[PDB]
């Protein structure tokens, strides 16, 4: 019995460990969010299938690493779901062919937010998985340890919903004018979704965001967001109603808004946070 990765790294008879570099495409799913499918990344075979049956489990202690170590979730092992980190060994999967077959492991994360996320830098550790191999031949009991690394920068969703983008830049027409903000949200299953803006405001109503351009700033203007003409101030929850699998636009538009005093030439910039909640 031995195993190898998609890039050819191998662990031989008797076990050992290897590093696995994977391209991530996290996605929200109903009740659990996909972190990484490894059934395309790790493969194993039985070396004497006419004579020996090999048994393979995911051993307890397998867990997320890096920034993901705080999170709990599930592991999908040959189609069935088990808690993750594994606190007890999974059932046994038979290996009975010389042909390399996938080790059918997919890691999921339990939602803890509405539409939150957590950044994964390329090259960081996301999981350590312990493959345990036994047989019906002798008392071999071998450990194949897979250190899973992110091969790319991604954001793993931590909520029931996901956004069209995490960083959006828009450019206003030269003053005066407005521009739509392209920003949508969907949820794996229907959720009662809201959101609220956060940022530095120049007015009492907390509805105009300060011009924080640092090079040659204009004066007397800020930025103000509208939802089809309704002013959206900071720290006020806006309801989106029920959001499901069809993307919903937040409906937002950026405007210049007077803040007081002579409006002078220069640059305008405002950074505005969006945070989703359940209602």
């Amino acid at each position: 019995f031995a195993c190898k990765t998609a890039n050819g790294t191998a662990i031989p008879i008797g076990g050992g460990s290897a590093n696995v570099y994977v391209n991530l495409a996290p996605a929200v799913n109903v009740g659990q969010n996909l972190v990484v499918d490894l059934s395309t990344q790790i493969f194993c075979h039985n070396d004497y299938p006419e004579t020996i049956t090999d048994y393979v489990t995911l051993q307890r202690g397998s867990a997320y690493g890096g920034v993901l170590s705080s999170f709990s979730g599930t592991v999908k092992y040959n189609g069935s779901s088990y808690p993750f980190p594994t606190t007890s060994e999974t059932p046994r999967v038979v290996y009975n062919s010389r042909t390399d077959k996938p080790w059918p492991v997919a890691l999921y994360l339990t939602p803890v937010s509405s539409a939150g996320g957590v950044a994964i830098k390329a090259g960081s550790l996301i999981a350590v998985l312990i493959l345990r191999q036994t047989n019906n031949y002798n008392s071999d009991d071998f450990q194949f340890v897979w250190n899973i690394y992110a091969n790319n920068d991604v954001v793993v969703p931590t909520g029931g919903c996901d956004v069209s983008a995490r960083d959006v830049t828009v450019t206003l027409p030269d003053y005066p004018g407005s521009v739509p903000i392209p920003l949508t949200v969907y949820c794996a299953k229907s959720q009662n979704l809201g959101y609220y803006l956060s940022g530095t405001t120049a007015d009492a109503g907390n509805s105009i965001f300060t011009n924080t351009a640092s090079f040659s700033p204009a004066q007397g203007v800020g930025v103000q967001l509208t939802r089809n003409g309704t002013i959206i101030p900071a720290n006020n929850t806006v309801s989106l109603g029920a959001v499901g699998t069809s993307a919903v636009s937040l409906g937002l538009t950026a405007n210049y808004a007077r803040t007081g005093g002579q409006v002078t030439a220069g640059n305008v910039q405002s950074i505005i946070g969006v945070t989703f909640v359940y209602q």
């Binding site: 960083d167 030269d174 203007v221 002078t264 220069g266 950074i271 969006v274 945070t275 989703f276």
Partner: peptide, 14 residues
């Protein structure tokens, strides 16, 4: 914040 919006604009002399 779950999302960060950056709004850029300009006031031109006229």
């Amino acid at each position: 914040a779950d999302v960060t919006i950056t709004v850029n604009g300009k006031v031109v002399a006229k």
